[PDB]
Design an enzyme around this catalytic site. Structure first.
Site, PDB file in Angstrom:
ATOM      1  N   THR D  28       0.836  -1.193   0.000  1.00  0.00           N
ATOM      2  CA  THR D  28       0.000   0.000   0.000  1.00  0.00           C
ATOM      3  C   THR D  28       0.879   1.254   0.000  1.00  0.00           C
ATOM      4  O   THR D  28       2.111   1.189  -0.009  1.00  0.00           O
ATOM      5  CB  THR D  28      -0.962  -0.024   1.184  1.00  0.00           C
ATOM      6  N   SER D  29       0.236   2.423   0.013  1.00  0.00           N
ATOM      7  CA  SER D  29       0.930   3.688  -0.188  1.00  0.00           C
ATOM      8  C   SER D  29       1.396   4.354   1.100  1.00  0.00           C
ATOM      9  O   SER D  29       2.218   5.274   1.029  1.00  0.00           O
ATOM     10  CB  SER D  29       0.031   4.666  -0.953  1.00  0.00           C
ATOM     11  N   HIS D  87       6.858  -0.522   6.211  1.00  0.00           N
ATOM     12  CA  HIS D  87       6.126  -1.742   6.501  1.00  0.00           C
ATOM     13  C   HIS D  87       7.083  -2.780   7.078  1.00  0.00           C
ATOM     14  O   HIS D  87       8.291  -2.555   7.191  1.00  0.00           O
ATOM     15  CB  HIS D  87       5.444  -2.285   5.247  1.00  0.00           C
ATOM     16  N   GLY D  88       6.546  -3.935   7.442  1.00  0.00           N
ATOM     17  CA  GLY D  88       7.378  -4.995   7.969  1.00  0.00           C
ATOM     18  C   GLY D  88       6.539  -6.142   8.485  1.00  0.00           C
ATOM     19  O   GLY D  88       5.319  -6.195   8.298  1.00  0.00           O
ATOM     20  N   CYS D 129       4.230  -1.652  10.118  1.00  0.00           N
ATOM     21  CA  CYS D 129       2.802  -1.879   9.980  1.00  0.00           C
ATOM     22  C   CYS D 129       2.572  -2.911   8.887  1.00  0.00           C
ATOM     23  O   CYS D 129       3.415  -3.120   8.011  1.00  0.00           O
ATOM     24  CB  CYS D 129       2.055  -0.578   9.667  1.00  0.00           C
TER      25      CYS D 129
END
Ligand SMILES: Nc1ncnc2c1ncn2[C@@H]1O[C@H](COP(=O)(O)OP(=O)(O)OC[C@H]2O[C@@H](O)[C@H](O)[C@@H]2O)[C@@H](O)[C@H]1O
Ligand SMILES: NC(=O)c1cccnc1
Lengths: 58, 171, 422, 222
Positions: D28-29, D87-88, D129
């Site tokens: 996602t962005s 992210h992760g 996230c």
């Protein structure tokens, strides 16, 4: 079921059936808005011409 | 700011040993803090689960916190701790749940604290008991435990995982 | 004649069939539930009978699970099934066009007829693919179009500063579907979050349950949709089943005290229990509507929605002209940039520092991901930017061509290597 | 004891913001992250740090950047701060092109692999996230260990959100607020406990930040 065929009294059989005439007819009598008529004619038949009374939505 | 430790009972303490002097020292220092220790010697590799289940279903309404020392050398820690996430242990909600472990994966809960060490009594436990004896009425638990970290490093190193939302003072 | 009154309906149904065919063939909740269709490109009338069956089943799943509506619930049902409904749009764009409204969906507004605006997100085209629908908010007051609507926000958000209110008797609404909440956000806003807190606070128990209760919890995301015929009974039945579960004095004291005054007393019951949505298939073109200015519109909203007359009205000096130019530098609005360049005479030092609210310097803003090549070309050609100057505050030691290559923008890279050695 | 934070200059700060991931990964962005990056920049700039903002670094660029900073001369500096926004997963962070392990990031900052940073705080803040975008209908950390490392994880984007554009994340802005208000009379551990008290408790309708601490002294930023 088939009365839509007889609706097309302007029998331009086997052709574009005068799509310009249909454009003129749509926005008189019932007072259709132009931006609705353009979508109507666009979805009537893609790629220019040849609706030839398809009525193949059924 | 801080937690509340003025309940009628200070809490419950469970010291589980698996086979000595460190266990006796822990018993003495925690009874000194007006706890209620229940020392259990070498148990079955599955016996601990129902031991936690029995103490999970209790009435801790007058108990300030919970301490579970796991002084041992295998059962998954996921099922040992998961009995207490508020919904199950309705009595233990909003109160500290300390898990001191000597012998990594971690479960994330609301008010859980962990403190691990390494196998090579024990210097970790001796330092912990000495720090708790010296500073228990002045320093917070975090400062006491980082002093323990400093002592162990000066003489591996313990790692601390904290989810507490308030400070903790043993008085 | 009369055949013109039937060909119009036939074409209206045919056009409305494509926004439902797209939603049903595409999207994945409809194959995760059992509603999907086969992709066709030009869908037939089979994309409407599916909606009819879905609405019938959704109505049955509550009507056949409720009780019998002994003596009092029928009055509440009849006050709702016979009321007057008006739909509110609230967009920030220019839609009045003098004497005829024209509101288009995303799939049409971006159908090679490029424009600006929108409030869609990601996933909306994946789960549902309802990006080819025009969204409205329902109003149960019953008062006419020439009034002041008594709602501003749909769930918690203000979608615009100009409400476009239309009556539910339009021939275009006949193919629109209802949903008791946001289609993508199945949740209902909390009692504390709900609008008109002066009403809910009068009943501190009513607002204690209308905060989380999703609909069709069999998937936590599936939502029930009702067609035009079944939309009026569904809201009443769901309201009754909610009421026969809540334990409050409202149930006896107010919901049967709103009968004679179905204005605020109904528009605050039904718009507090639920948050309804109406979705007209493709285009809302009509000559009977009403435009009410709820609040003044900001520079950011006028820039984002390319409201050129509103933008020219808002911009009165150069200190805010440069702010609007920065707003257009972001978001890549080429029409706004051209309009601002055609009126004001800017200087190279005007863009020498980011105004408050902007986190990037001129070159990084011009070269970033969603940048505009028209604005970059104009700035380079008018000498307002340096092509080879390196970044200093973010990614220090890199140039604009580094962003062009990094984000894979061939047009921007070609434009960048036209004005400098690089 | 304390960490002796009265050196000429007070450490070095690194902020890495990832927002536009490669289309191959399909991610996602991450809207509304530049506000978080600017908030962190201002917050740690008020603390006499030397901030370095890096936006959208690939997997191989983060390792090179970290190896380039671990070989500097931090002899005049008191500490070292690193912030990661991307992210992760439970124990790994994501670059724009591919995931990169967190253990390899901190190996350059070991006591023996970095002589200039010994007995000095080394702070790592992770905001990872992962969206539940399973379009059909919808628990640990691999942690390294050394004498003076502190980690602060937050693997949660919030329980829910509305169509309003997000103003960042409650974790980051709460952390910045506590740093602005309390970080001249309180220790860092107390600040993190207050951040835990705010986030995931006052944000109730779900995860909560976990504070892994190995520091051997107390941290006073003044
Ligand atoms: N002729 C036009 N000229 C300019 N703008 C236009 C025109 N016709 C329509 N627009 C505007 O373009 C926008 C279309 O964007 P959408 O993303 O479809 O926005 P909206 O209709 O607000 O959708 C609501 C969004 O929030 C909720 C729901 O889940 C949805 O995704 C609207 O603001 C609409 O007014
Ligand atoms: N287009 C809108 O403003 C709108 C109104 C109500 C619900 N969803 C969207």
């Amino acid at each position: 079921i088939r009365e839509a065929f007889r609706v097309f009294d302007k029998d331009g059989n086997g052709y574009i059936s005068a799509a310009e005439l249909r454009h003129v007819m749509t926005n008189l009598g019932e007072k259709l808005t132009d931006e609705e008529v353009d979508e109507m004619i666009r979805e009537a038949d893609i790629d220019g011409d040849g609706q030839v009374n398809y009525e193949e939505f059924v | 700011n801080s937690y509340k430790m003025d309940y009628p009972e200070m809490g419950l303490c469970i010291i589980i040993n698996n086979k000595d002097v460190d266990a006796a020292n822990l018993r003495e220092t925690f009874r000194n803090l007006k706890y209620e220790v229940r020392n259990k010697n070498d148990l079955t590799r599955e016996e601990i689960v129902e031991l936690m289940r029995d103490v999970s279903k209790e009435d801790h309404s007058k108990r300030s916190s919970f301490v579970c020392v796991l002084l041992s050398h295998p059962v998954d820690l996921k099922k040992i701790t998961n009995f207490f996430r508020g919904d199950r242990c309705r009595s233990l909600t909003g109160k500290p749940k300390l898990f001191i472990i000597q012998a990594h994966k971690i479960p994330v809960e609301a008010d859980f604290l962990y403190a691990y060490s390494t196998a090579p009594g024990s210097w970790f436990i001796q330092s912990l008991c000495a720090m708790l004896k010296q500073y228990a009425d002045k320093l917070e638990f975090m400062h006491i435990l980082t002093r323990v970290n400093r002592k162990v490093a000066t003489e591996q190193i313990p790692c601390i995982v904290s989810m507490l939302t308030k400070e903790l003072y043993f008085y | 004649a009369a055949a013109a009154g039937k060909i119009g309906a036939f074409l209206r149904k045919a056009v409305a069939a494509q926004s439902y065919g797209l939603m049903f063939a595409n999207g994945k909740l409809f194959e995760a539930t059992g509603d999907a269709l086969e992709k066709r490109g030009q869908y037939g009338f089979s994309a409407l009978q599916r909606l009819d069956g879905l609405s019938r089943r959704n109505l049955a799943a509550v009507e056949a699970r409720l009780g019998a509506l002994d003596s009092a619930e029928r009055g509440l049902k009849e006050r709702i099934m016979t009321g007057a409904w008006h739909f509110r749009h609230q967009s920030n764009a220019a839609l009045d066009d003098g004497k005829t409204a024209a509101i288009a969906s995303n799939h049409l507004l971006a159908r090679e007829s490029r424009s600006s605006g929108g409030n869609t997100f990601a996933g909306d085209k994946a789960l549902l693919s309802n990006h080819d629908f025009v969204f409205f908010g329902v109003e149960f007051s019953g008062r006419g179009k020439q009034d002041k609507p008594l709602n501003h926000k749909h769930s918690t958000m203000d979608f615009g500063a100009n409400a476009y209110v239309v009556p539910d008797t339009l021939p275009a609404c006949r193919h629109g579907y209802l949903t008791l909440t946001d289609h993508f956000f199945n949740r209902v806003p909390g009692g504390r979050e709900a609008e008109h807190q002066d009403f809910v606070g009068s009943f501190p128990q009513m607002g204690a349950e209308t905060g989380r209760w999703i609909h069709e919890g069999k998937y936590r995301q599936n939502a029930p949709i009702f067609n035009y015929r079944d939309m009026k009974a569904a809201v009443a039945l769901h309201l009754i089943e909610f009421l026969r579960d809540s334990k409050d004095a409202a149930f006896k004291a107010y919901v049967f005290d709103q009968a004679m005054q179905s204005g605020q007393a109904l528009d605050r019951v039904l718009n507090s229990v639920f948050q309804a949505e109406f979705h007209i298939p493709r285009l809302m073109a009509t000559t009977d509507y009403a435009k009410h200015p709820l609040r003044p519109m900001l520079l950011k909203e006028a820039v984002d929605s390319v409201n050129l007359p509103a933008l020219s009205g808002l911009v009165s000096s150069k200190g805010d002209a440069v702010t609007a130019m920065w707003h257009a530098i972001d978001k890549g609005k080429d029409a706004v940039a051209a309009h601002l360049l055609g009126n004001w005479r800017f200087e190279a030092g005007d863009f020498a520092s980011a105004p408050p609210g902007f986190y990037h310097e001129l070159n990084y803003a011009l070269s970033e991901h969603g940048a505009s090549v028209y604005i970059l070309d104009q700035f380079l050609s008018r000498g307002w930017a340096a092509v080879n100057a390196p970044f200093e505050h973010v990614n220090s030691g890199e140039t604009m061509l580094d962003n062009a290559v990094k984000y894979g923008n061939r047009e921007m890279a070609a434009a960048l290597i036209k004005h400098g050695a690089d």
